[PDB]
From a paper:
ExoY virulence factors are members of a family of bacterial nucleotidyl cyclases (NCs) that are activated by specific eukaryotic cofactors and overproduce cyclic purine and pyrimidine nucleotides in host cells. Here, we explore the Vibrio nigripulchritudo Multifunctional-Autoprocessing Repeats-in-ToXin (MARTX) ExoY effector domain (Vn-ExoY) as a model for ExoY-type members that interact with monomeric (G-actin) instead of filamentous (F-actin) actin. While Pa-ExoY requires actin filaments (F-actin) for maximal activation, Vn-ExoY is selectively activated by G-actin in vitro. The catalytic domain of NC toxins can be divided into subdomains CA and CB, with the catalytic site located in a groove at their interface.
In the structure of Vn-ExoY bound to actin and 3’dATP, the electronic density and coordination geometry suggest that 3’dATP is coordinated by two Mg2+ ions. To unambiguously distinguish metal ions from water, we replaced Mg2+ with Mn2+ ions and collected an anomalous data set at the manganese absorption edge. The anomalous difference Fourier map confirms that two Mn2+ ions are bound to 3’dATP at the positions occupied by the Mg2+ ions, with no significant changes elsewhere. (B) The model-phased anomalous difference Fourier map from data collected at 6.55 keV, shown as a green mesh contoured at 5.0 σ, confirms the presence of two Mn2+ (grey spheres) bound to 3’dATP in Vn-ExoY NBP. In the active site of Vn-ExoY bound to actin, 3’dATP and 2 Mg2+ or 2 Mn2+, the K533VnE-LID side chain is too distant to potentially coordinate the ATP 3’OH moiety if the latter were present.
Author numbering:
A (entry chain B): 466 to 863
B (entry chain A): 4 to 40, 49 to 371
The structure:
Amino acid sequence: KTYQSRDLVLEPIQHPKSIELGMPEVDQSVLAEVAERENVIIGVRPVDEKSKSLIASKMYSSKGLFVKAKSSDWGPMSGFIPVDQSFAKASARRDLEKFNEYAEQSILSGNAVSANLYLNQVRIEELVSKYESLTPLELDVDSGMYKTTATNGDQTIPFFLNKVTVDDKELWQVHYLREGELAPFKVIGDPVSKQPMTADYDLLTVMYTYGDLGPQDKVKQPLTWEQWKESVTYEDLSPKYKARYDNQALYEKQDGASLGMVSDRLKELKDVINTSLGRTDGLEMVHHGADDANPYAVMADNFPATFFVPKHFFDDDGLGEGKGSIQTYFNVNEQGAVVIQNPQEFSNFQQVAINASYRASLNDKWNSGLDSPLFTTKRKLSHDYLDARDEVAKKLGL
Amino acid sequence: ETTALVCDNGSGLVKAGFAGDDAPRAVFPSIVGRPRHQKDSYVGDEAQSKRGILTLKYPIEHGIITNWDDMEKIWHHTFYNELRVAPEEHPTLLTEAPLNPKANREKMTQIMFETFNVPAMYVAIQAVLSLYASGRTTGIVLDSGDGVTHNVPIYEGYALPHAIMRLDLAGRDLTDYLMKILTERGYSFVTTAEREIVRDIKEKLCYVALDFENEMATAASSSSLEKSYELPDGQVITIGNERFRCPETLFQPSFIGMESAGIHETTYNSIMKCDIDIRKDLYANNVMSGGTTMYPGIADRMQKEITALAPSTMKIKIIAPPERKYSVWIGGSILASLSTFQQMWITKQEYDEAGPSIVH
Ligand SMILES: Nc1ncnc2c1ncn2[C@@H]1O[C@H](COP(=O)(O)OP(=O)(O)OP(=O)(O)O)[C@@H](O)[C@H]1O
Ligand SMILES: Nc1ncnc2c1ncn2[C@@H]1O[C@H](COP(=O)(O)OP(=O)(O)OP(=O)(O)O)C[C@H]1O
Ligand SMILES: C/C1=C/C(=O)O[C@@H]2C[C@@H](CC[C@H](C)/C=C\CC1)O[C@@](O)([C@@H]1CSC(=O)N1)C2
Ligand SMILES: [Mg+2]
Ligand SMILES: [Mn+2]
Ligand SMILES: [Mn+2]
């Protein structure tokens, strides 16, 4: 019942805990199927609990690499991207000027619009009752709005909701106190639809099978449309890529800079994820490369991560003979998501996965903040490689 | 006092990385392309990418280096572009095919020391490395790559040269065979560009039938063994018995006009050419390596075929690791990282005095 392999000992899970995830349950089930179908281990960074119904509604588009402004995880703006980043999650408030500049550049460049924030009764009742992240609606006379408050740690910021109707949609327009006067709350909207965008699904890592390692696994830097045109040969490109060769705007929108640092494998797996999710033509949830290849990776912001593994990992001895099943050592929810809670648990998960022939891509920024550099080539060597070297040294008298 | 380099020079792919690592850092095609008509030469990924504006050449034919000028470009690209290392600062282990001419190992030793000035260098046999990658020093290896297939019996770290079998059929021939038999469906694949679509079809949809005859009958009476494949241009094609007929050529080389014996026959024949005392150790440690051994069902069919030829007393074991496409590289990484093995490398001092013959 214990996973023991070289210097790695994992005790089985005693009393499994329920982890509240922001990813909607049908999306976890899609990703568990994508993992089995493609034979890859897909890791996804956290999504806040309050973003679930927004993502599940399939109404909104999500933020890509051109919208670096963080989403919020408190107040009525929960799950949305405030233009004023002092209303976003704590990471954004740490370097407020940087994220405020990000918010403006995305809008002023035409990669997003400044949109109004409207919430329906369902979302208001969800924030007051379900999450208790908003206090009850109290009429402010001589204003006509419903006063509510939210917590920003040691701050209790007030918000005023005004009952309005748009396209016969009976909604609450969020208002705040901007420099003493009562202003409308602005959030970052999609450049084409003009509607507020939600947070995206960020791939943490994608562990591919060793037998499938190849040139597609090389992480590539964003090429300009001109550098890319010279790089490829027109006739070998599929119509999807020939279109990008003959449309600088299409390449700039679906490829190039928008993808970041990405492998050819991940560019294609992103399309498989998005198609499988029904998130297409502006509604995509995966926009770019993985945290594997992110120069600006913050390890603090990567947990809890949901990992989707090929179905054999769930079998009586999926991790190898006498090793056991992945559910025995890591929390696996009803949908098949292996919920990794911290860098130590991630390091252990990656070792078990490497041992079962799934290749890790290690980012050195993952080691920042860690007591020991867990994510290094030497530390993450395959136990089948180490065991073979020990056997060969013993046999050859070395 | 430095990391050793490992460079597996395959007919189709170069696998390069650092000794001590569990996988290579660079896996790229063994091709050099010169302008068809803004560099003078292009290697690996760049050459394949710019296929339409270059004349591609393969410097390694059937595991043997045939173009030394193009091979120098592949090696330069490996150190400077892929590994980003100074060749003169790392001892380098290179691989060679079984039965590699003595002059070929001398010439690559001459190039390693004269052209790249490596501090030290070692030349290992690919199949021997594969065995080490599975923690073994005795057994028989079937190494099937892109240009050549070999049967290599090994006893306590040493290959038995008299029992080495070379088979000139490998992955590349199976792709050409898949293009040929795909014509029997009304499909056409002729170009070098189209050959890569057929190579993808083969890797994703091919498998080895445990009973070829029964599989051909099943494919003839039902569409249960059929699979769909979407081409780049969006057109979806159907693949039927070609899924298992393509790797069947490994067992029945007469399929590609070859008067040769199948991989199972050559394995048995190689074991029979060895001492009766060590034959038990060879039957129980039959290791499979190379990309052409990646077909689902190849180990079950090998087990069935060898079992038929061997005495009923004899216990047969087929070892086919999931990472067996990289076994040769892994083996070299294991050997060159054993610091107790340091007393087995040819140094530049040894080369300067004795010349390229030191490698023997
Ligand atoms: N999954 C797969 N199924 C079948 N064939 C495959 C698969 N993956 C790779 N191959 C084939 O394996 C070959 C490449 O493998 P490999 O790295 O062993 O060759 P190599 O070292 O370049 O060649 P050689 O050993 O002949 O000099 C190609 O023909 C490729 O099509
Ligand atoms: N492969 C990559 N190459 C380059 N940049 C990348 C890559 N992967 C991620 N990034 C960087 O990391 C950022 C991902 O974070 P982002 O999605 O903007 O915010 P977040 O912390 O997930 O919060 P939200 O809830 O989405 O607001 C975007 C980009 O700066
Ligand atoms: C992804 C990949 C795989 C491979 O095995 O590639 C190697 C190297 C390659 C070189 C030419 C080609 C146009 C370039 C790149 C393909 C590299 O030739 C191969 O595809 C040959 C020809 S078709 C076949 O099955 N093997 C094998
Ligand atoms: Mg080879
Ligand atoms: Mn995000
Ligand atoms: Mn993102």
